[PDB]
């Protein structure tokens, strides 16, 4: 029978240098550039560099037909190109779509990169027309989302909303509808924009509508750090490095597992009860999203990720404390969680 | 501060040859061997071979602490070793756990390989004691599962049950209880074994209890092909190559998406209504499980995997037919699906 697709071994990652970098940007709508330090001469360093190149090669093969290019910029050999393009963070990926530039800070894998770039290709604002499109919108809960009601696609207040959407694309989805019926179900006046914090039932409306590009961006910046945030591969590093006071409240819960789903519903509740605390942000990690880190997590934290967990992690040395839970008795409720949090921090 | 783990570039994949293969099998509890053809000389083939070596290297690093080794066996240079070990399927992975041998036939990626090998390390039979462990068992539906009720692990009929579990480890989970309360909830007599076909509400009891090792293996062999099957990466190739009559009924549905969950519930219903048809076998593909194949699938089948799909695929040329659904009307019902498949097949 016909075989599944496979990596064909063809090289597609452009070696970007001073003479071709201008042609490359014109060739591709979306361009992903790995800004890297010159590979050390030792064996292991040469292998690490090799792994990262092939990951780009595999991604380039997948996204060749959709017009996504992949390039490498050497921090010394191509230093002038780094200067003209603004590549500062060493050993990191930059994504270019038309004008805007995205400083990728997520997992460096073929799966995650292709997913992220496919989201990048999409327009910054997604429209909602039928009730099924609204019902899909109302079901999002692991991303902060915005919804606005505007008269037409040509409205001046919509372009400001769209321009603001470009500042957070694709991490934070921006939705808009021109159907008053959908707007009525959401209690959205004309040109009003609602911000739904992740895992929160009731939204927050942006004051002083209509809103300009700057008013929207300022609002999102002040509200993007949700009280409960999910560790997603597209942004795991940005999220983890955003520690409040040198520690993270980490909770492991497998959504598909019954014990994991129940424990998550408790977390959502604790977050809803304490959503106004400006210093509280809990990281939810679904171990199913990071299969390669599970053994490392069980080893470092001395926990069994087959059962739900919650703890405090020192981001400096990975020192940790974890709430103990009985495998026979029922899982702790919001009351027990709120009390366990207050004690370990006091 | 502290960095996430990374590939360190150290080589851990053993070059298995006639002089070391016996020492290797004594070193590791679980050993995965890539039986591979000698690498071709061209550039592209040299990259493909390189890609596959690093994927093994990445898994070798993740599972070093848990005692899992990784080796490569060349079909010509190590042909005598392949002879002694029984490595016939070229360019494929063989996993050895003590005595048993598992002929891996799944996705060749680090994520899937580590997930699979971690399941191999687990014992073949998982026990159920409390109420929470029971409810976790009852939630499984994408795997065929077995459950038996015995007196204790020293029982003769439990040891026969455990020996049979090794023949299907870890693809088919074998569960067992010694708790009479749990047995009552499952309507299980003593030494009775219930077989829950995937996506089915009611089990099938193995007749002529108590059952021997061979009676169980035979029963599972005759029931392994569930009427509805999920394409899982650990076994995607085995599933796909098991064409009914040179064709597959393929259904795409993203479980987390509301429209995909409903269409899956409809699929579950259609499967339950025809579970006694020996020829009907539907493959369910969750596009979230195969992010690198989504562009290839949308291009080949001319479908949009953001909406649920169902169709018939010729396994020889990837020719296909797909049920058109309106993006504004409600999703098709079980009857409408039964009406579309029987129509295209007649
Ligand atoms: C699936 O497609 C294959 C070809 O891609 C079909 O096989 C051909 O069938 C015709 C007559 O049916 C023969 O003349 C050709 O020689 C066959 N070619 C090959 C390569 O097998 C097959 O019939 C199709 N299956 C269905 C169910 O339509
Ligand atoms: C984290 O660990 C460091 C030592 O590595 C220690 O100095 C610091 O105080 C710890 N932080 C907290 C919040 O305990
Ligand atoms: Ca370069
Ligand atoms: Ca997103
Ligand atoms: Ca309002
Ligand atoms: Ca205003
Ligand atoms: Ca909040
Ligand atoms: Ca070898
Ligand atoms: Ca399994
Ligand atoms: Ca029964
Ligand atoms: Ca008998
Ligand atoms: Ca059946």
Residue numbers in the entry:
A (entry chain A), B (entry chain B): 3 to 348
What text comes from the article?
When studied in solution, Casq polymerizes as free Ca2+ concentrations increase and depolymerizes as Ca2+ concentrations decrease. We also showed that both glycosylation and phosphorylation alter the physical characteristics of Casq substantially, including its oligomerization and Ca2+-binding capacity.
To investigate any structural significance/role of glycans or structural change due to the presence of glycans, the crystal structures for both native and recombinant bovine Casq1, which correspond to the glycosylated and nonglycosylated form, respectively, were determined under the same condition. Calsequestrin crystallized in two forms: the low-Ca2+ forms of native and recombinant bovine Casq1 crystallized in the absence of added Ca2+ in the crystallization buffer; the high-Ca2+ forms crystallized in the presence of 2.5 mM Ca2+ (17× molar excess of Ca2+ added to solution). Low-Ca2+ native bovine Casq1 crystallized in the P1 space group and contained four molecules in the unit cell; the resolution of its diffraction data was 2.74 Å, whereas low-Ca2+ recombinant bovine Casq1 crystallized in the C2221 space group and contained one molecule in the asymmetric unit, with a resolution of 1.88 Å. Each monomer in the low-Ca2+ structures of both native and recombinant Casq1 contained five Ca2+ ions, while the three monomers in the high-Ca2+ asymmetric units contained a total of 38 Ca2+ ions. Superposition of low-Ca2+ recombinant Casq1 onto the four low-Ca2+ native monomers in the P1 unit cell had an average r.m.s.d of 0.40 Å.
